[PDB]
Amino acid sequence: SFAGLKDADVAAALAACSAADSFKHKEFFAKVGLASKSLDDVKKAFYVIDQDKSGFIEEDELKLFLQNFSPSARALTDAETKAFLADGDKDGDGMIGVDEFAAMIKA
Ligand SMILES: [Mn+2]
Ligand SMILES: [Mn+2]
Ligand SMILES: [Mn+2]
């Protein structure tokens, strides 16, 4: 709700990635609805995911990604995490800042 996402798209998207090692971020952002929202909402989701308010999505926070969507969601695998961080962290600091995050969703 935090990023104006609908219950039904979140339900459907978790359905597909229910299973270990099956998460694909790009497919998820599309299905959950995030790829078609405004930049502003893309930013509020960003700041939701950054649980510690550091201004960056640290790797440990990227691992509990799904949990922001649903409390009973699984943590991502290290393989899933690495893959996500590979795509998102273009400045090579090992963290995802707001601008990288936003940019990665623009696909
Ligand atoms: Mn953080
Ligand atoms: Mn932390
Ligand atoms: Mn970075």
Swiss-Prot record:
Gene Ontology, cellular component aspect: axon; axon terminus; cytoplasm; dendrite
Positions contributing to Ca(2+) 1 binding: D50, D52, S54, F56, E58, E61
Positions of the EF-hand domain: 37-72, 76-107
Keyword Transferase: no
SUPFAM superfamilies, A to Z: EF-hand (SSF47473)
Protein purpose: In muscle, parvalbumin is thought to be involved in relaxation after contraction. It binds two calcium ions.
Leftover remarks: This is one of two major parvalbumins found in the white muscle of pike.
Protein name listed in UniProt: Parvalbumin beta
Source organism per UniProt: Esox lucius (Northern pike)
